[PDB]
Amino acid sequence: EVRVVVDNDPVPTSFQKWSQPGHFDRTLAKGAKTTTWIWNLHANAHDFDTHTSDLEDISRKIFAAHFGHLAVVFIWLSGMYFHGARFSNFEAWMANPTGIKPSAQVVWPIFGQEILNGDMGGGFHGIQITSGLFQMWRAAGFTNTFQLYCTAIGGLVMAALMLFAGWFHYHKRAPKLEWFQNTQSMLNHHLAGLLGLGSLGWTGHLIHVSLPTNKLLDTGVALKDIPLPHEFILNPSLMNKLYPHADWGFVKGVVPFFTLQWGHFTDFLTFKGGLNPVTGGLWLTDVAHHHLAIAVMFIIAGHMYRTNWGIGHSIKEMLDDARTPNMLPFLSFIGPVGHKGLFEVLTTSWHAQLSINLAMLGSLSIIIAHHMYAMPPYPYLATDYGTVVSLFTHHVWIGGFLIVGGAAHAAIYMVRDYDPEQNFNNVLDRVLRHRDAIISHLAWVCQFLGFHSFAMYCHNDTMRAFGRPQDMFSDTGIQLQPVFAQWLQHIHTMTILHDPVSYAFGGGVVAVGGKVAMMPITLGTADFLIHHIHAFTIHVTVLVLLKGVLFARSSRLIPDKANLGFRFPCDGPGRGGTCQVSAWDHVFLGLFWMYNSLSMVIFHFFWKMQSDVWGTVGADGVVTHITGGNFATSSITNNGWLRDFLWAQSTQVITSYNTSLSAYGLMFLGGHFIFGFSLMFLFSGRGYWQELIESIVWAHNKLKVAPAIQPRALSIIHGRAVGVAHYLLGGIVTTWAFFLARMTAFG
Amino acid sequence: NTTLVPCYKSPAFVERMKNAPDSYYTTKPLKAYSQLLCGEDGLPRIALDRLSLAVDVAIPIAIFLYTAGFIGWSGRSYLQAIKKQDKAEEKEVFIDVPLFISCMVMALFWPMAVIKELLAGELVAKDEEIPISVR
Amino acid sequence: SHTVKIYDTCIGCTQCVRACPTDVLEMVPWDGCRAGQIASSPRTEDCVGCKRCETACPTDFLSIRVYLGAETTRSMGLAY
Amino acid sequence: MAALYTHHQYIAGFLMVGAFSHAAIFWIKDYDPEQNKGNVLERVLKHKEAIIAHLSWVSLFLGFHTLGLYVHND
Amino acid sequence: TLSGQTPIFGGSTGGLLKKAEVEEKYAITWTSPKEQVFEMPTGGAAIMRQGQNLLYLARKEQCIALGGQLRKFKITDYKIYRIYPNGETVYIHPADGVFPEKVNQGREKVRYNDRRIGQNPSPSKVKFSGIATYDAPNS
Amino acid sequence: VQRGSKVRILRPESYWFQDVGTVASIEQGGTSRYPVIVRFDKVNYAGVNTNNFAQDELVEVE
Amino acid sequence: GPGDFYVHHAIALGLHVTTLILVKGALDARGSKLMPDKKDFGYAFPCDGPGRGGTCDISAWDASYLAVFWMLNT
Amino acid sequence: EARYLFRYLSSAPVVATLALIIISVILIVLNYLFPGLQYGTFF
Numbered sequence A: 001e002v003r004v005v006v007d008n009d010p011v012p013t014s015f016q017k018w019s020q021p022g023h024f025d026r027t028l029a030k031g032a033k034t035t036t037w038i039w040n041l042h043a044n045a046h047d048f049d050t051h052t053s054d055l056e057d058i059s060r061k062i063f064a065a066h067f068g069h070l071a072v073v074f075i076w077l078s079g080m081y082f083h084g085a086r087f088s089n090f091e092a093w094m095a096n097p098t099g100i101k102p103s104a105q106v107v108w109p110i111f112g113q114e115i116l117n118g119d120m121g122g123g124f125h126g127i128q129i130t131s132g133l134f135q136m137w138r139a140a141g142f143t144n145t146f147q148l149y150c151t152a153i154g155g156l157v158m159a160a161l162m163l164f165a166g167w168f169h170y171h172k173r174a175p176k177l178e179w180f181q182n183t184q185s186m187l188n189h190h191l192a193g194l195l196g197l198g199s200l201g202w203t204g205h206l207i208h209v210s211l212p213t214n215k216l217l218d219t220g221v222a223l224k225d226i227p228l229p230h231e232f233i234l235n236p237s238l239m240n241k242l243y244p245h246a247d248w249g250f251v252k253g254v255v256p257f258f259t260l261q262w263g264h265f266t267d268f269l270t271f272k273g274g275l276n277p278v279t280g281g282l283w284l285t286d287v288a289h290h291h292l293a294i295a296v297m298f299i300i301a302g303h304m305y306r307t308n309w310g311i312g313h314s315i316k317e318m319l320d321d322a323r324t325p326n327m328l329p330f331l332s333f334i335g336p337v338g339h340k341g342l343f344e345v346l347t348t349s350w351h352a353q354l355s356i357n358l359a360m361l362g363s364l365s366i367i368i369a370h371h372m373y374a375m376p377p378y379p380y381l382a383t384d385y386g387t388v389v390s391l392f393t394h395h396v397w398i399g400g401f402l403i404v405g406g407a408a409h410a411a412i413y414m415v416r417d418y419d420p421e422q423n424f425n426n427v428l429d430r431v432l433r434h435r436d437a438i439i440s441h442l443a444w445v446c447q448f449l450g451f452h453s454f455a456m457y458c459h460n461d462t463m464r465a466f467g468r469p470q471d472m473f474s475d476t477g478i479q480l481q482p483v484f485a486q487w488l489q490h491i492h493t494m495t496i497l498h499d500p501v502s503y504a505f506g507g508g509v510v511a512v513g514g515k516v517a518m519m520p521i522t523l524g525t526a527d528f529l530i531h532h533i534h535a536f537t538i539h540v541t542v543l544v545l546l547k548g549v550l551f552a553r554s555s556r557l558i559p560d561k562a563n564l565g566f567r568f569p570c571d572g573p574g575r576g577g578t579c580q581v582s583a584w585d586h587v588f589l590g591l592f593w594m595y596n597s598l599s600m601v602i603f604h605f606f607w608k609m610q611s612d613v614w615g616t617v618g619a620d621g622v623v624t625h626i627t628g629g630n631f632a633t634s635s636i637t638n639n640g641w642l643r644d645f646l647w648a649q650s651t652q653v654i655t656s657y658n659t660s661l662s663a664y665g666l667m668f669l670g671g672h673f674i675f676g677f678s679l680m681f682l683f684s685g686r687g688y689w690q691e692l693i694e695s696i697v698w699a700h701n702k703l704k705v706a707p708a709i710q711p712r713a714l715s716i717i718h719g720r721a722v723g724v725a726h727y728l729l730g731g732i733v734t735t736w737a738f739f740l741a742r743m744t745a746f747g
Numbered sequence B: 001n002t003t004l005v006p007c008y009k010s011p012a013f014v015e016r017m018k019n020a021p022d023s024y025y026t027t028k029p030l031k032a033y034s035q036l037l038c039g040e041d042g043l044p045r046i047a048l049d050r051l052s053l054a055v056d057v058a059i060p061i062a063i064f065l066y067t068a069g070f071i072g073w074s075g076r077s078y079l080q081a082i083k084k085q086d087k088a089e090e091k092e093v094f095i096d097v098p099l100f101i102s103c104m105v106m107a108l109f110w111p112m113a114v115i116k117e118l119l120a121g122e123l124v125a126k127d128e129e130i131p132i133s134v135r
Numbered sequence C: 001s002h003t004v005k006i007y008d009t010c011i012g013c014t015q016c017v018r019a020c021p022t023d024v025l026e027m028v029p030w031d032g033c034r035a036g037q038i039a040s041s042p043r044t045e046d047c048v049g050c051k052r053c054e055t056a057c058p059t060d061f062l063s064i065r066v067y068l069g070a071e072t073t074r075s076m077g078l079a080y
Numbered sequence D: 001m002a003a004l005y006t007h008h009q010y011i012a013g014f015l016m017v018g019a020f021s022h023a024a025i026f027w028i029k030d031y032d033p034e035q036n037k038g039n040v041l042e043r044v045l046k047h048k049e050a051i052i053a054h055l056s057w058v059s060l061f062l063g064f065h066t067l068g069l070y071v072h073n074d
Numbered sequence E: 001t002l003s004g005q006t007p008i009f010g011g012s013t014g015g016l017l018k019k020a021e022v023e024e025k026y027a028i029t030w031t032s033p034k035e036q037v038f039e040m041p042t043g044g045a046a047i048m049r050q051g052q053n054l055l056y057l058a059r060k061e062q063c064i065a066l067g068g069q070l071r072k073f074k075i076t077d078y079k080i081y082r083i084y085p086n087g088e089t090v091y092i093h094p095a096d097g098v099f100p101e102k103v104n105q106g107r108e109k110v111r112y113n114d115r116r117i118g119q120n121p122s123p124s125k126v127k128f129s130g131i132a133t134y135d136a137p138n139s
Numbered sequence F: 001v002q003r004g005s006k007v008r009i010l011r012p013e014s015y016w017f018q019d020v021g022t023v024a025s026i027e028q029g030g031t032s033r034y035p036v037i038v039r040f041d042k043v044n045y046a047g048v049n050t051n052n053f054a055q056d057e058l059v060e061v062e
Numbered sequence G: 001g002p003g004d005f006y007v008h009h010a011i012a013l014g015l016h017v018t019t020l021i022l023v024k025g026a027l028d029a030r031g032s033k034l035m036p037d038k039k040d041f042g043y044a045f046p047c048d049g050p051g052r053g054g055t056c057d058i059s060a061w062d063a064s065y066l067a068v069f070w071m072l073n074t
Numbered sequence H: 001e002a003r004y005l006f007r008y009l010s011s012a013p014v015v016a017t018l019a020l021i022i023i024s025v026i027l028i029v030l031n032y033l034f035p036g037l038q039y040g041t042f043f
């Protein structure tokens, strides 16, 4: 039975525990002896699996903390709509989305920092935003700043709604454990009720607000003549000169949908498959049709799993039937148990669920980044070159942090929530029973690719210096063509309906006005060599993270590693030395390798777009790119990455003093600080530093100013966590300040 | 004595006042920099002379070093207050602000309060009461 | 082949013996404690060097040391 | 002229790190407090937490006002 | 010597290597009143039998990490052997039959210094001598 | 050196060298060689504040 | 000029920190409160385990080592 | 109980985050004091 059970008032509501920090752990509540109590109070505040032991009381803390998180997104989402309401040039940008630059977030007149208020066109002085908010509100049908303001008001009352529901579901009506454990019913309402009714609600907005507004904005009605979006429903004769093949009446226009004469909708539900050549984005008839085929497919697929009416699938039976009397005979190697005892894994532990939901949301956010540049979805997005790169670079970094989190909680599951009772000889036992064959062949293909992607950049670097340009892996020397990726560019242009979907594959140059939106991205030897840099760096990022998941239980070094914990520094200087043997220090080492992997994805993007896609078109048809075919000849030596990319494209962030890009020149140099500052914590150890506090504590005990919270150096784990939190901060903000000073000096 | 001419007759500083914006940052703070010594590139230097900049250099000393030893003396007299109450482990996290303000207005006259503990020998702790290492 | 010496500041709380992963230490009878015990290390050839007995000793400036010396095949934990 | 300045300053930085590397090997391996009783070599260890507490003030002074005076000028 | 039935284990990869055939190899031996499942020190999970069990491990830290696991299954009767490749089975844990946590008599104060730890001699006392500073026969 | 008295430490190898501590218990057996257990108000290094001491390395302050 | 005032305080910051690491390496080569028997362990040892908070880089070799990063920097 | 609320607002991160908004008086002493105030230009 799939009934609802709650608990009436389980937790009191008082400020008595706010006066006692560290109440959740028993060793933190007994007092603050040293300053390690300060740091342990924040490293354990959200470890809800160590505050209590029962999954009924843990899962109420999980459910009530999502509500307080959703009430934090709604504060930030009401700050993007409020800044577009009061502190922006959204009026001047909507009239002319080519000459006027998108800007919110004006700067106060103090400390001489009003030099950052550069000229945005039309007498507006502010900071050129690269978040794509202006190109997104135009696609939603926003026309005046009153509609942006009462979205920001409507989100603040949606933040107080989501914040009241976290107090209500922890202090008044907290659910029970058998309400959280019916994950078949949860998948019915998230597929159909959330992803199906969300893309059914949005395709009703598109054809009633976005499709009328973006039709009249292409005729240039100049924001007096355009109607407010309720006047396309209250006045249905107004949407009849647009889209005349339908009827557009309250009851008279819907009946082509029920009588299945869907040819009445074929003018505003198209399958054109291309870019709008006036704006640059996709057709909003093509997008509104897309959400209708998504809402059908999701509401259908939300009736797959069995709730209390008998009919439906059950994941408990589908998982337990994949044993090996019934498999395909070439993948019948996975156990006579199969993966019985695996529905008990993803229901009785939240870390097992978090490791899949982070690696899927991480890999989704990189698929999203690869699609919003090749199929640009918003009007005037693709020609705002500062927005195209800052949305690819954003969701690649966001979607790569979540991958490392998907491999952190796949290691907290093994140390804490793994049970050898329910996992005997199933599909997870059999992986730990051969984990020196997974890691041996992973550490070979990381080694095979490191020689065949990086040492081919050292072969080209030596032939170019020798004066032998015919001996190196060029398009002019020893050609390495992407034979299987030049062929898929041939398939996706020979299967066109009549318009060539995704001009990145081939055919046509979308050059909507001034600058060029999309062009074919051809692939040569410089694209063969750089896709194997990506294949190499992804595999070592996997090898570091997979070694921390398989060897989180035990090893040949420390066979009792799951008793030392997940987050422990070492097991002493024995066995030669066993520092960073934990599963935490493979998340820590996979964060540098996520960094090195994703910083070359955003450098391959930023240079291939400038040299082979972006640029300006004249009055003949030839395109002069931003760097001018530079990736084909000089991105094959990593002296060419040093000279033609890092040195030659940072002339906009170096010479950005006394101008309006002045903060990008400071964040560039403030970024190099935090990277070099990170190396104090990474390279040194805490026994130097604890033995240095003791000589400084002495100078306070001498002058009688010693504290009773006794000053201790940071932990071994805490000293490694702040050495990677600074490397991955000052290494990102120096790339953020270079990607944006280069592209907001052009546009 | 040096080549640091004042910014009144420096021939490279008057161009910084010739072509300039107005708002609040390059008009009134620029004519107040005119009595400052500046080199051959029109940038107001900070030299140390005998009497012409005797108190002109001693205002940033005496203004800072008072409220350097005002933060330090109210932090020292607060840590000594909460250790005679025998509750210093818990009063350092939860700051007892009626006492920290009381130990702040006792530090407003700290130069005539430090030397009342130097001659009384109570500023420093004696070497046989301070924890050390094996030396 | 490390060197696990044991000094007379012991209190016989047996905590180093429970923390040893290789059974190097063991409790022998003594006269200078209330437990009447002191640790001894007869199987110091099995000392893996990991100093886990040193983190468990509660006497200040602990009564047991591991002096990391000439390492061998069983003092380095090599299963290959 | 440029490669001979940078040569002899990196040699002189290495030779001064090694002048203090063998100070540390002298204290460990070659010093006994019984023979050096009451002399000038025991008096340094008698207050060695006042030299390290004052080298760490000059270090803390010269970096709060040299980095801070650059990134004010920056 | 040693005997017993091996637990139901479907083979692993973290098991014995060429060191176990050539240098030394360890064997833990316990008995179980139940058909329960335990975690292997070589990765995975195995079902121990109901009679005398016998499991060959590669080093001594794997046996006592397993011996510390059986003590949580309320099985405190395990014997650890050490098998040289010529067949010589010595018996090493627990040596006297009694566990090393609780005290027995006849055992010796071996590797014991009769001083405080802080009054070890300086390394200039033992200069160009065979002994180390922690051997130090004075006190 | 009685129970409850404040005492200073003359053990150079210890953490609490020249630190005032409160005596917790003294052993009356006479064969344990570290009878007096003194409790300190600051922990040493992630751990204890009590330690067994001798009587020749302890100087009382009151 | 004033560009030379500022670098001589970076040079002075450089010579004082790399003296601080080397003097603390030489004077705490006998031992301090984190481990009072550094002489019994030699010059170059890794650590003394994760006990007492953790003692990475505690030796006098590992303070003649962090001051090569400061010698090369200065 | 609102008598344990201000016993939480007197804790360490609260009074040392209001020890930075009270050091927004360097914002007001550099707003109307024609912000440029060098080391010789104030008395």
Ligand code: CLA
Pocket (backbone or CB within 6 Å): D002, D003, D004, D006, D007, D010, D011, D014
């Ligand atoms: C950046 C700092 C710096 C600079 C500018 C120099 C500059 C110089 N060095 Mg060098 N050197 C340095 C640091 C530096 N040194 C340090 C820290 C060491 C100690 C390891 C050395 C040790 C050294 C030696 C032994 C020699 C020099 C020599 C020279 C001179 C000729 C080389 C040349 O043309 O420039 C080129 C650019 C360079 C960076 C020079 C690199 C020379 C390396 C450091 C030699 C190191 C030897 C190596 C460790 C052993 C290799 C043995 C085997 C594998 C073959 C030149 C003036 C040569 C000389 O004395 O002229 C007659 C010479 O014999 N130096």
Ligand code: CLA
Pocket (backbone or CB within 6 Å): A443, A444, A446, A447, A448, A449, A450, A451, A454, A455, A458, A540, A543, A544, A589, A592, A593
């Ligand atoms: C640029 C510096 C650098 C280099 C060259 C490497 C190289 C390597 N890393 Mg490393 N790493 C680095 C920085 C570097 N890393 C940093 C800064 C971190 C900090 C977090 C790490 C952390 C890290 C981890 C955690 C791991 C590695 C691994 C590896 C190995 C990958 C296997 C491979 O690619 O085979 C190819 C070899 C190369 C790419 C090296 C260049 C080869 C040259 C060009 C050819 C040499 C020519 C010839 C043979 C020279 C001989 C001449 C003769 C006179 C001697 C590889 C040797 C992974 C591993 O173990 O792999 C199994 C591993 O897991 N690294």
Ligand code: CLA
Pocket (backbone or CB within 6 Å): D014, D015, D016, D017, D018, D019, D021, D025, G043, G044, G061, G064
């Ligand atoms: C007159 C000069 C002099 C002399 C006689 C010594 C003598 C000694 N030193 Mg020493 N030292 C010196 C200067 C000197 N040092 C300087 C200038 C420094 C600062 C860097 C040091 C820092 C230092 C440390 C930290 C230690 C010593 C140690 C020692 C003792 C043993 C040496 C050893 O380990 O074996 C032989 C040494 C080697 C075989 C060298 C190893 C490899 C080095 C790093 C060369 C690498 C260069 C590289 C390969 C070239 C690049 C090739 C090309 C690609 C460019 C020995 C008595 C050790 C000791 O006393 O132990 C108790 C010890 O720990 N020294």
Ligand SMILES: CC1=C(C/C=C(\C)CCC[C@H](C)CCC[C@H](C)CCCC(C)C)C(=O)c2ccccc2C1=O
Pocket (backbone or CB within 6 Å): A680, A681, A682, A684, A685, A686, A689, A690, A712, A713, A714, A715, A716, A718, A719, A720, H016, H019
């Ligand atoms: C520098 C460093 C330290 C020392 C780090 C310290 C001491 C942290 C510094 C944080 C300071 C102490 C912040 C404290 C701020 C105070 C609360 C004062 C603020 C009060 C005002 C706001 C009123 C380590 O402990 C360490 C450990 C392991 C590897 C590397 C390192 C390492 O590199």
Ligand code: SF4
Pocket (backbone or CB within 6 Å): C009, C010, C011, C012, C013, C014, C015, C016, C017, C037, C038, C039, C056, C057, C058, C059, C063, C064
């Ligand atoms: S070394 Fe530790 S466990 Fe052993 S007797 Fe001494 S205090 Fe007890």
Ligand code: SF4
Pocket (backbone or CB within 6 Å): A574, C004, C019, C020, C021, C022, C023, C024, C025, C046, C047, C048, C049, C050, C051, C052, C053, C054, C066
């Ligand atoms: S080093 Fe390891 S095996 Fe040896 S006595 Fe210490 S804890 Fe036991």
